[PDB]
């Protein structure tokens, strides 16, 4: 298939001790600007880092001077980490990520719901919920008898389900006058034409 | 830093005693896959992604090895300064709209070290996700729970006693 290549952790020369590594790849305009940053963490403290924007291992603390001044010597280690900007970042973006995450699209499931029981002419609150979508760009606008209502509208923050689907709930403070038609109008990059789901008075 | 997409590739985590490990691959917040270390098997969050791409768990196993190494040398280097514990917090929310007669997710943050245990007031059993990396080098972890009608218990060293979020 296609190739998910991880970076190569360069190596060093009742209690608990924690150590952590990661290779961050910051893409903008696809691959028109890649920034590679590599971080080493002992006990919640980042002590060494290779930041592509520098081009060398710089120490973040006194514990870092040994490993940074060390790894900068042997280029079998440096030039490899330096070029991980293509062997990991660029390669991974242009390769498996295209065949997967940069290709995931799931259209939202949109459902209006009247939280307090309907009592016409009494004030109530409509809840347009929008569930199960990817990526996270989405815009949810409310209409009271075909006119955008921004007043009395409160959306949540974006909600990471963590299984590659988001969630947003949008509240409308409103009041059922009979014959009125509220519509939840949802716009998403997985939608050829915007979604409109209606609730009749 | 400011960007459009952010791959968090090759996350290695180790901690002794007990040599606990984790090797993971994030891309925009969600987890692509981990490597099961005991099964020596790459386990994709999304199975569909598994059919569309591949990762060789040996790279994860080597990297975790290097990390056990570095952890040992560094544990020495500091006169053996131990890890500071961290109070964790949870928030529970449902994945789809919950309609009486139709998944419940628990979201714990400020986890550190990476050892939490996740729980009608009786024992029940779920999917748990590998730990996710924060900017402050603690972690957050998520636990799902699959019929509503008329909680979350967390046990940690930063907790004097445990806590539950009803």
């Amino acid at each position, epitope marked *: 298939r296609v*190739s998910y*290549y991880g970076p190569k952790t360069s190596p060093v020369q009742e209690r608990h001790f924690v150590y952590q590594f990661m290779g961050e790849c910051y893409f903008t305009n696809g691959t028109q600007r890649i920034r590679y940053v590599t971080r080493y963490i002992y006990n919640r403290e980042e002590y060494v880092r290779y930041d592509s924007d520098v081009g060398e291992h710089r120490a973040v603390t006194e514990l870092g001077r040994p490993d940074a001044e060390y790894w900068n010597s042997q280029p079998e280690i440096l030039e490899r980490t330096r070029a991980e900007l293509d062997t990991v970042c660029r390669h991974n973006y242009e390769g498996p990520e295209t065949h997967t995450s940069l290709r995931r699209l799931e259209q939202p499931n949109v459902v209006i719901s009247l939280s307090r029981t309907e009592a016409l002419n009494h004030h109530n609150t409509l809840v347009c919920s929008v569930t199960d979508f990817y990526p996270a760009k989405i815009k949810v606008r409310w209409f009271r008898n075909g006119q955008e209502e921004t007043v009395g509208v409160s959306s949540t923050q974006l909600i990471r389900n963590g299984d590659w689907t988001f969630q947003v709930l949008v509240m409308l403070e409103m009041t059922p006058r009979r014959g009125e038609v509220y519509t939840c109008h949802v716009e998403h990059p997985s939608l050829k034409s915007p979604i409109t789901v209606e609730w009749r008075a | 830093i400011e960007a459009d997409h952010v791959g968090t590739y090759g996350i290695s985590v180790y901690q002794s005693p007990g040599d606990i490990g984790q090797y993971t691959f994030e891309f925009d917040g969600d987890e692509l896959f981990y490597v099961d270390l005991d099964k020596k098997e790459t386990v994709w969050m999304l199975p569909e992604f598994g059919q569309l791409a591949s990762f*060789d768990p*040996q790279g*994860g196993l080597q990297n975790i*090895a290097v990390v056990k*190494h570095n952890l040992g040398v560094l544990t020495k280097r500091s006169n053996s300064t131990p890890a500071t514990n961290e109070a964790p917090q949870a928030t529970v929310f449902p994945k789809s709209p919950v309609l009486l007669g139709q998944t419940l997710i628990c979201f714990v943050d400020n986890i550190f070290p990476p050892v939490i245990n996740i729980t009608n007031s009786k024992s029940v059993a779920v999917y748990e996700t590998s730990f996710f990396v924060n900017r402050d080098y603690s972690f957050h972890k998520l636990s799902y729970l699959t019929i509503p009608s008329d909680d979350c218990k967390v046990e940690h060293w930063g907790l004097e006693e445990p806590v539950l979020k009803h």
Partner: T-cell receptor
Amino acid sequence: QQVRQSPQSLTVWEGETAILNCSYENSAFDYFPWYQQFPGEGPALLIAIRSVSDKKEDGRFTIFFNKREKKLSLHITDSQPGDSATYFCAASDTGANTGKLTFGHGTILRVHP
Amino acid sequence: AVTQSPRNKVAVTGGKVTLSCNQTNNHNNMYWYRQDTGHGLRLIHYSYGAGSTEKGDIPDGYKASRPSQENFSLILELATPSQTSVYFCASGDFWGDTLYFGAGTRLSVLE
């Protein structure tokens, strides 16, 4: 995946040019070491090339690498009899951070004094 | 360097046989191949560091053990004639680009 070395053994007269061949299937491969083994002994790295370059020349030996057709060729010139060995051709996808090395089956060399 | 041990062994079918390897290179990775004509070098077991072992392409019959950074070891728990061969041991560095082999062990499993 597999790596195939031809011919399974080769015989060359002193001073002639040994030409040892190798072909790998997996295009992910980017490191190509050649290990030489002398009877009674473990094998040891003779000469390696990486896919970026098309030839590493080390005095008497030269690797020729073809990325397109996925083909190698090790040239020994003016071969002395101390070159009569078995030559193995390896490849690894280094990005794979495997550890594992994939070893071709080996050509067996006879240098005719 | 890499000294394997013993370099010649003769043992019966059904009896335990323990090769051994010592590596003075401050290396981290160790490997146990066997060489056969027509099937070349084939990897059986390997190890990233003390305590872990990983299964190579032919782990059937042999169990490995890494109790030291210097010491890998094979174990033919129940020997079989099909196991008779020239066994080899190697080691290398993390992300290292060279395999440092041992000299050899000639093993004869006999009925």
